[PDB]
From a paper:
In the nucleotide pool, which is more susceptible to oxidation by reactive oxygen species than DNA, human MutT homolog 1 (hMTH1, human NUDT1) is the most prominent mammalian enzyme among other enzymes responsible for sanitization of the nucleotide pool. hMTH1 is characterized by broad substrate specificity as compared with Escherichia coli MutT; that is, hMTH1 hydrolyzes different oxidized nucleotides such as 8-oxo-dGTP, 2-oxo-dATP, and 8-oxo-dATP with almost the same efficiency, whereas MutT shows high substrate specificity for 8-oxoguanine nucleotides. Accordingly, hMTH1 prevents mutations and cell dysfunction by its hydrolytic activity toward both 2-oxo-dATP and 8-oxo-dGTP. Here, we carried out structural and kinetic analyses of hMTH1 and demonstrated that hMTH1 shows broad substrate specificity for 8-oxo-dGTP and 2-oxo-dATP because of the exchange of the protonation state at Asp-119 and Asp-120 depending on the substrate.
To validate the correlations between the structure and kinetics in the Asp-120 mutants, crystal structures of the Asp-120 mutants (D120N and D120A) in complex with 8-oxo-dGTP or 2-oxo-dATP were determined, respectively. In contrast, during the recognition of 8-oxo-dGTP, the structures of both mutants (D120N and D120A) show modes of binding of 8-oxo-dGTP that are different from that of the wild type. The face of 8-oxoG and the direction of deoxyribose are completely turned over in comparison with those in the wild type complex: this phenomenon is the result of the loss of two hydrogen bonds between Asp-120 and 8-oxoG. In the D120N complex, Asp-119 and Asn-120 interact with H-N2-C2-N1-H and O6 of 8-oxoG, respectively, whereas Asn-33 with O6 and N7-H of 8-oxoG. The 3′-OH group of deoxyribose in both complexes is directed away from Thr-8 and Gly-34, which are involved in the recognition of 3′-OH in the wild type. These findings are in agreement with the higher Km values of both mutants for 8-oxo-dGTP in comparison with the wild type. The electron densities of 8-oxo-dGTP in both mutants are ambiguous as compared with those in the wild type. This result indicates lower occupancy and/or loose binding of 8-oxo-dGTP. The differences in the recognition of the 8-oxoG and deoxyribose moieties between the wild type and the mutants give rise to the difference in the position of the triphosphate moiety in 8-oxo-dGTP between the mutant structures and the original ones (active configuration bound to the Nudix motif) in the wild type structure. The structural arrangement of the triphosphate reflects the lower kcat values in both mutants.
Author numbering: 1 to 156
């Protein structure tokens, strides 16, 4: 009986590494994140994901593939986040730091889970195995999960 707002999250996943972005400023700074943000009026979810990737990382790609959907709920916030998660298939430039985000590559045996949002530990492994998923996580603040669900699915 809550409303949701649409967000995207994009993982540039290559065979041996993944690109993540360090939030540099404001509340939440200091954590490594996928690239993403609010979907804007009119644009498709995929086009919103492509735009956020360009804005936050500098990479321009023609196409993404959707791998999952995750709902976030925060204690004290009545609006849910409806997060559509995408991976890149191919990229063709270099990442660039903004004043808001610093991109960095991590080898896939060095995924920095302790410095990522806590839910990422649950769904990232499915993403790495090329599986699709649906998830829901309820947070007290930034660090504490009170309830969550995660299910591999055949169709997002
Ligand atoms: N639980 C969880 N929350 C995340 C992840 N990544 C992520 O940005 N968030 C949270 C932090 C923020 O509350 C929200 C992101 O919203 P935002 O306002 O930063 O998005 P945005 O950059 O489009 O905002 P704006 O600059 O356009 O105002 O989602 C994640 O992987 N897991």
């Amino acid at each position: 009986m809550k409303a949701s707002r649409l967000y995207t999250l994009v993982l540039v996943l290559q065979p041996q590494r993944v690109l993540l972005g360090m939030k540099k400023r404001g509340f939440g700074a200091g954590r490594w994140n996928g690239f993403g943000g609010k979907v804007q009026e009119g644009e498709t979810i995929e086009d919103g994901a492509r735009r956020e990737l360009q804005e936050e990382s500098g990479l321009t790609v023609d196409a993404l593939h959707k791998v999952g959907q995750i709902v976030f709920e925060f204690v004290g916030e009545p609006e849910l986040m409806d997060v559509h998660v995408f991976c890149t298939d191919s990229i063709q430039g270099t990442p660039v730091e903004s004043d808001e985000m610093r991109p960095c590559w991590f080898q896939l045996d060095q995924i920095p889970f302790k410095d990522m949002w806590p839910d990422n530990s649950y769904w990232f492994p499915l993403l790495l195995q090329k599986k699709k998923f649906h998830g829901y996580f309820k947070f007290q603040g930034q660090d504490t999960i009170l309830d969550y669900t995660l299910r591999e699915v055949d169709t997002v």
